[PDB]
Amino acid sequence: KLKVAINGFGRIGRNFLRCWHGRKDSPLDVVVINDTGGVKQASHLLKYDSILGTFDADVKTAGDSAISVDGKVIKVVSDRNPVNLPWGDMGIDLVIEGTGVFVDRDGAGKHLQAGAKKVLITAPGKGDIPTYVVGVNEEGYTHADTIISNASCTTNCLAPFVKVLDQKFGIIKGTMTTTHSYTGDQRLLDASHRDLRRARAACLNIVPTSTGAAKAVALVLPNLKGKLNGIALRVPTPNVSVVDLVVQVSKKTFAEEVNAAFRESADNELKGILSVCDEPLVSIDFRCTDVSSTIDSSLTMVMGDDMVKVIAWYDNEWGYSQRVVDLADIVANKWQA
Amino acid sequence: KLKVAINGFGRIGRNFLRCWHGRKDSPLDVVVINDTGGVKQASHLLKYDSILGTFDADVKTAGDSAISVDGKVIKVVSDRNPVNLPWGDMGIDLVIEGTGVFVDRDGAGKHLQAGAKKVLITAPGKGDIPTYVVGVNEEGYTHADTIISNASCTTNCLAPFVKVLDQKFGIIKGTMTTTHSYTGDQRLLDASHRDLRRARAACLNIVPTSTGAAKAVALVLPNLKGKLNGIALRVPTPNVSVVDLVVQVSKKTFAEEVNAAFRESADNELKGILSVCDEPLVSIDFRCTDVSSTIDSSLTMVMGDDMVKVIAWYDNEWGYSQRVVDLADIVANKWQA
Amino acid sequence: KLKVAINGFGRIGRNFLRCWHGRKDSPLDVVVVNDSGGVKSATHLLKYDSILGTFKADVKIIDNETFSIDGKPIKVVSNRDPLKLPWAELGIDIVIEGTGVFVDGPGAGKHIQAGAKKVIITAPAKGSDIPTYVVGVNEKDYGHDVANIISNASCTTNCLAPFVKVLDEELGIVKGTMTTTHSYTGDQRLLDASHRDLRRARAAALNIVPTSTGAAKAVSLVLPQLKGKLNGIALRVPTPNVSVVDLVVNIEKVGVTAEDVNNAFRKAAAGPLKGVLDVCDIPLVSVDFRCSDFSSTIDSSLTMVMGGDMVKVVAWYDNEWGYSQRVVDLADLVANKWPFCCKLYE
Amino acid sequence: KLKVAINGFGRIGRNFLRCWHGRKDSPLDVVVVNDSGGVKSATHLLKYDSILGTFKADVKIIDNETFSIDGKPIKVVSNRDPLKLPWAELGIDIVIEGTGVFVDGPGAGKHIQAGAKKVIITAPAKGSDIPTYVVGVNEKDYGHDVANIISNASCTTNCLAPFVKVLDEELGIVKGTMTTTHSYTGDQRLLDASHRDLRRARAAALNIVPTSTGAAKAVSLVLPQLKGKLNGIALRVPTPNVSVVDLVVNIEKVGVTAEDVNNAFRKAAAGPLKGVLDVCDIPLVSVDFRCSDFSSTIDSSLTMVMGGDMVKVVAWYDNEWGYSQRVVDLADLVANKWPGLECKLYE
Numbered sequence A, B: 001k002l003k004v005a006i007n008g009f010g011r012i013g014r015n016f017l018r019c020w021h022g023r024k025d026s027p028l029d030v031v032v033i034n035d036t037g038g039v040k041q042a043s044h045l046l047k048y049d050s051i052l053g054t055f056d057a058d059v060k061t062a063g064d065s066a067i068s069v070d071g072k073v074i075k076v077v078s079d080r081n082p083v084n085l086p087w088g089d090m091g092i093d094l095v096i097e098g099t100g101v102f103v104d105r106d107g108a109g110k111h112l113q114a115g116a117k118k119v120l121i122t123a124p125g126k127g128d129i130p131t132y133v134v135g136v137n138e139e140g141y142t143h144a145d146t147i148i149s150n151a152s153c154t155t156n157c158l159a160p161f162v163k164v165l166d167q168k169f170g171i172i173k174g175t176m177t178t179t180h181s182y183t184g185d186q187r188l189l190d191a192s193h194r195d196l197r198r199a200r201a202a203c204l205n206i207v208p209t210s211t212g213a214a215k216a217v218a219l220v221l222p223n224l225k226g227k228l229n230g231i232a233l234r235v236p237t238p239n240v241s242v243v244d245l246v247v248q249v250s251k252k253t254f255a256e257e258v259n260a261a262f263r264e265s266a267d268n269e270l271k272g273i274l275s276v277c278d279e280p281l282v283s284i285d286f287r288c289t290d291v292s293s294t295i296d297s298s299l300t301m302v303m304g305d306d307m308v309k310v311i312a313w314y315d316n317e318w319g320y321s322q323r324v325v326d327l328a329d330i331v332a333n334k335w336q337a
Numbered sequence C: 001k002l003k004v005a006i007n008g009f010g011r012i013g014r015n016f017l018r019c020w021h022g023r024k025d026s027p028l029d030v031v032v033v034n035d036s037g038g039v040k041s042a043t044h045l046l047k048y049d050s051i052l053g054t055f056k057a058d059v060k061i062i063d064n065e066t067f068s069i070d071g072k073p074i075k076v077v078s079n080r081d082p083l084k085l086p087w088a089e090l091g092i093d094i095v096i097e098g099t100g101v102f103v104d105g106p107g108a109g110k111h112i113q114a115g116a117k118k119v120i121i122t123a124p125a126k127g128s129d130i131p132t133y134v135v136g137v138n139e140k141d142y143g144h145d146v147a148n149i150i151s152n153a154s155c156t157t158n159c160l161a162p163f164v165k166v167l168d169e170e171l172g173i174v175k176g177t178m179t180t181t182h183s184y185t186g187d188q189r190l191l192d193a194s195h196r197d198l199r200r201a202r203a204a205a206l207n208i209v210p211t212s213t214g215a216a217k218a219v220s221l222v223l224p225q226l227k228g229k230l231n232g233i234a235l236r237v238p239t240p241n242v243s244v245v246d247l248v249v250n251i252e253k254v255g256v257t258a259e260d261v262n263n264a265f266r267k268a269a270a271g272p273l274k275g276v277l278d279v280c281d282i283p284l285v286s287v288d289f290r291c292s293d294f295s296s297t298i299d300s301s302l303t304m305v306m307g308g309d310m311v312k313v314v315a316w317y318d319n320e321w322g323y324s325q326r327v328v329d330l331a332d333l334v335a336n337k338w339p340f341c342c343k344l345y346e
Numbered sequence D: 001k002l003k004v005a006i007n008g009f010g011r012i013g014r015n016f017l018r019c020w021h022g023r024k025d026s027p028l029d030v031v032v033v034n035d036s037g038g039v040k041s042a043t044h045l046l047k048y049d050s051i052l053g054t055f056k057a058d059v060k061i062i063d064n065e066t067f068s069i070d071g072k073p074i075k076v077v078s079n080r081d082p083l084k085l086p087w088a089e090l091g092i093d094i095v096i097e098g099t100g101v102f103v104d105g106p107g108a109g110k111h112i113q114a115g116a117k118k119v120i121i122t123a124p125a126k127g128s129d130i131p132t133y134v135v136g137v138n139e140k141d142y143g144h145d146v147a148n149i150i151s152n153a154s155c156t157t158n159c160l161a162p163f164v165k166v167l168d169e170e171l172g173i174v175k176g177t178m179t180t181t182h183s184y185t186g187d188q189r190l191l192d193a194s195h196r197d198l199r200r201a202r203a204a205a206l207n208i209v210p211t212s213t214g215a216a217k218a219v220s221l222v223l224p225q226l227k228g229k230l231n232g233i234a235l236r237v238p239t240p241n242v243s244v245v246d247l248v249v250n251i252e253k254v255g256v257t258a259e260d261v262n263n264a265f266r267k268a269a270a271g272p273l274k275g276v277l278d279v280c281d282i283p284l285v286s287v288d289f290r291c292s293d294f295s296s297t298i299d300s301s302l303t304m305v306m307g308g309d310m311v312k313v314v315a316w317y318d319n320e321w322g323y324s325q326r327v328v329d330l331a332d333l334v335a336n337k338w339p340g341l342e343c344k345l346y347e
């Protein structure tokens, strides 16, 4: 029912579209795609992906301003300035802002002007914007919000199981470090950048960069304000990343008790979001994983009874997209006028 | 003045030999090299390295059982069983055990039988063996010890600055995670291994493997027994790794105070071992670094006044070798018999 | 209908088992594996694969030596010396020798002595008395009673042969050279370490590595007419799988144009080589050929004739999957026509 | 003696500056750089390089626009529009245009309008009025007064030309094809994203990527005799630097053997091409050619003649360093022959 528009047909743009195609009876409906690239570009890359692999569906370049996916036709436009996009003309109810530039009130807004009704930012919001992490506080949402951010790929992982911890052992304080696959943001070869680290090789180094997911947790778990904070390491992998949380709780606890708690929630409340895995695996073994976070049980370890460390895997691309969809999936429900 | 024998002309074997060639007036003197490989193999790989780059020196295959390095001649033998090596015949005073198999009393001993006097194990010792980390307790050494281990590449990094912490803020407890370059130990392609993780792709994954450096710290810093423990992540990089320590100290402290302490020691006592670096760099920027550990100041962060996180780089190959040499450099001094 | 054993549970052997599982209804029936690692090490790696991705099916560990893929059991033994193998006891009809060690008559035959009926080597034979087949080319040449030891050639040779044929058989190949940008392989060092070939001894992951290859000459083994006319090298590049061949043979025929050379393939592709050859006109890259059932795929837009006589082709082939798929066809055949040094780099 | 500007402080441009620094006593003198990033972004990257490794020398930030390499200052400006450049004010004699944008007469010439004397493009010209030179081959063909805009060709073309010459000039090249397994480059996407060439748009680091290349045809630009006889493709493979060419030309001459073809190189190597060509008999791999001053190196053991007429060669060349080194020789030339004597895409 709910008409959707994908702006920024990049990795999350496409990982999303596809994430969608796989859902059954989706309140969402993609109708237009806006990306600096021509219909050719949109077709090819939606069909041939170097990380998700060739898309199982018939994808042809039907039209001069459209592409076809199993028959469902979609228009492809291209204006580097949103205001122009015919969101109003096409009655765009929701826009999936995955460009990486329009992350602020001012920017995301240009979509509203174009005639769009709502703008889901596929990234953390800059400034005063509603941030929601499906599984951590989606009930906070109200059809009243015109601009929401579905947080970062990291936060969307770290959050779910942080809630589980605090909500059970009480997080006093704690740092975290996310060994992360690289992203479009990094330079393929030592080239200029505003982050002289991110500006480096990307594929030949462990690139320490900073992440907001640290304080962003607090954004959705008000309780942890200023209790968490960490950095990130960009290692030579195109996808799937791991977080290394280290919190100090009040209630003395032990290894398996922690994991247990996780499982319990993963089987009840967080079913579909969090999950545990005992089988000793590795990065690649976590591609296309519909869940936001996956605890590597056998790794979890406690110290001095109150210092807990938890490792957790997550597909920064797919898993996130599945969340983005789940959020938009929500906007479609609890939508009045 | 001290005759040396390199057994296991692998990465640490060669990284060492070369590390040595660069030292001025070295009490050490390499005379024989034992590796499963022929004189060809020893030459080539000592000259052409994919990580240290071509060796600046004239390296020819002089002999049927020897090679030449700037004239200094060295014999190359090859017996998969040490006992046979003519250590006694050549009056081998010291053996640099870098094969990865002879890490126990029984094994390393076969060198003693061959006529060797001492055996420096380029890895952590298995069982009851003297473990020393240059800069952390080399004074514990005594010419009495016939078999010593120079600990692991990780421990040799983590130790130096742990001493600094505890010796100043008092480490109560703390975990750590080392994002580590891969090593000969991993499988290049999903193949059998006793560690189904290490058995995986290696270059396509973040491989969680376990490390002893956690408890090994205590080995050289008796005080931290059972206070530290962590895991490790094998990421797609051939060299240079980073450690992510997270200790809880007693004495409340803040960001720059910690770093300060580090610098102080790095300029005085640990001068040559530890060191700090503010210039925001990355992995590759730390190749050939004579020091054991290097603190990434701008990354250091504290929480709730007592939870300290410190990131630290280190060249698991070179820097270690330089330590190995420094240890052997010591055995030559304070040598009576 | 026919009992099969798999000696060597690594890449090619595992790629085999997988290929075979999800199949129409192969007369083959894997009942035993010989992975020097037990049910654990042999299971795990069949379920989780870094290049094929988590295997889609319930794989559980029954017994202490008998895992099961969706209920169907598979006994697993382990011993480096085939002679000690229970081939006879189990009554093994075909053995997929995928270790890369037993590739000579004496060796691979050790399986017959253990009680095996027929042996298929997943690599080129080192002998001369063993037949080299390449489905699509000369598979007919195989008939029961004719040698109980065959070789499914090389990954490269099985990608070349097919379209090499169509070239000579419909244009006449005078002679030519060739190169193959090849995904690194297990025989290479992970980091610079001792290895009988100072090229393979270099970090497989960070070098373009030149290494000899007979795959060129061996084409003859299936296409006699070319005997001693082809040849070339190989280049290892940091890519875990899927490779490409660069053939440059100056033709004998007229001086045909580019796009027609193609048409020959296209013709012979949907015709006699329907399942082996194929031509992809859409500009893709290596990663797009993962899990490709075609023994060879030509990049249309890349083909190009130079001086009327000199033709240049480029083909895409998944070295793991593709080959393994043929190896299941060649084992599928057997059944349809049924009544220094020693070690050296491990 | 001669003042030099470097427009474009990236790989090739920085590889330049480096090449130039540790040199005999080049008549050249870099006094300004145009890196759209300031002294910070421009310094850092000159000091710490992922492919060349930390630069060996005191590099400090003086002024707010004037870093220094061992005391010697280098003013640094930044503006996408050459016209606004202080070339005249500073009195720039040579400009190393290494951006890959200004490669046509009109463009690269914008530097002259700003006050530049001569402009060298570190890439093939898109025009036709601009001379393409390849040190070792036809460098003589350059003399003052003859065009104030030249192109040092391509990294590939500068690796091919040299040994392509010796082949034809001492064996006669009928015609042939060629391929080049090439280290990925900045123009490629890091991860699958929009790009005018759906091949370069694929993860540069995880694919073998086929992409057209004129480097083959352009050989003629320096070796007319071959005009329209060579040609080929290129394959991008997950290797940040150092590449190899696979030439397959069936010769005109007799039907010589392998190892003699080599000898020709070996001969012309220590002779007329001493500094450009070279032959390495020892079996190595790409990584062993990092920082190689030779514009081309043949893998002896790889060469092989097939049917008497068809010869096949394989050469090694560091695309960053090598080219940059020639680019400093070609700029070294300009100075030795200077008076005092006689739908915009990609990203």
Ligand SMILES: NC(=O)C1=CN([C@@H]2O[C@H](COP(=O)(O)OP(=O)(O)OC[C@H]3O[C@@H](n4cnc5c(N)ncnc54)[C@H](OP(=O)(O)O)[C@@H]3O)[C@@H](O)[C@H]2O)C=CC1
Pocket (backbone or CB within 6 Å): A007, A008, A009, A010, A011, A012, A013, A034, A035, A036, A037, A079, A080, A081, A082, A097, A098, A099, A100, A101, A122, A123, A124, A152, A153, A183, A184, A316, A317, A320, D193, D194, D347
């Ligand atoms: N990569 C990941 O793992 C994750 C990313 N995200 C977030 O999702 C967003 C997209 O990230 P990612 O997909 O990785 O990035 P990409 O660069 O892959 O995708 C962004 C796309 O938007 C296009 N684009 C840029 N500007 C416009 C414009 N003005 N109008 C139309 N199209 C435009 C870009 O084209 P062009 O580059 O040519 O301008 C590109 O195709 C970011 O907010 C990111 O933080 C969230 C979770 C995970």
Ligand SMILES: NC(=O)C1=CN([C@@H]2O[C@H](COP(=O)(O)OP(=O)(O)OC[C@H]3O[C@@H](n4cnc5c(N)ncnc54)[C@H](OP(=O)(O)O)[C@@H]3O)[C@@H](O)[C@H]2O)C=CC1
Pocket (backbone or CB within 6 Å): B008, B009, B010, B011, B012, B013, B034, B035, B036, B037, B078, B079, B080, B081, B097, B098, B099, B100, B101, B122, B123, B124, B152, B153, B183, B184, B185, B316, B317, B320, C193, C194
């Ligand atoms: N890699 C690193 O970063 C670090 C490693 N170390 C330690 O140093 C040791 C060596 O490690 P590393 O250099 O990485 O390993 P390598 O595998 O690179 O080196 C060991 C070498 O010894 C050879 N070899 C094995 N057995 C024999 C034998 N019986 N006789 C003669 N030669 C033999 C091996 O050949 P082959 O494999 O064919 O048997 C190999 O060439 C290990 O203890 C390791 O834990 C310490 C710090 C860091």
Ligand SMILES: NC(=O)C1=CN([C@@H]2O[C@H](COP(=O)(O)OP(=O)(O)OC[C@H]3O[C@@H](n4cnc5c(N)ncnc54)[C@H](OP(=O)(O)O)[C@@H]3O)[C@@H](O)[C@H]2O)C=CC1
Pocket (backbone or CB within 6 Å): B191, B192, C007, C008, C009, C010, C011, C012, C013, C034, C035, C036, C079, C080, C081, C098, C099, C100, C101, C122, C123, C154, C155, C156, C185, C186, C318, C319, C320, C321, C323
């Ligand atoms: N990978 C590909 O794309 C292609 C490979 N091939 C060829 O097929 C062969 C296998 O290749 P690949 O699958 O990559 O190799 P793998 O390493 O995956 O498989 C070889 C297997 O044999 C086992 N093994 C080794 N020695 C013995 C022994 N003595 N007795 C019993 N089992 C043993 C190995 O165990 P362990 O390692 O523990 O010793 C391993 O499980 C090689 O000849 C290769 O050249 C042919 C075409 C393509």
Ligand SMILES: NC(=O)C1=CN([C@@H]2O[C@H](COP(=O)(O)OP(=O)(O)OC[C@H]3O[C@@H](n4cnc5c(N)ncnc54)[C@H](OP(=O)(O)O)[C@@H]3O)[C@@H](O)[C@H]2O)C=CC1
Pocket (backbone or CB within 6 Å): A191, A192, D007, D008, D009, D010, D011, D012, D013, D034, D035, D036, D079, D080, D081, D098, D099, D100, D101, D122, D123, D154, D155, D156, D185, D186, D187, D319, D320, D323
């Ligand atoms: N790398 C190699 O091995 C070879 C490359 N070449 C060619 O040389 C050229 C440069 O290659 P490479 O060094 O890899 O590229 P880089 O990306 O390293 O360098 C290009 C530089 O130009 C800057 N720039 C971009 N647009 C402008 C502009 N409009 N005005 C001023 N400066 C600008 C870029 O900054 P920013 O990115 O911020 O826009 C960057 O600093 C390309 O044509 C390439 O094909 C030739 C032979 C070899």
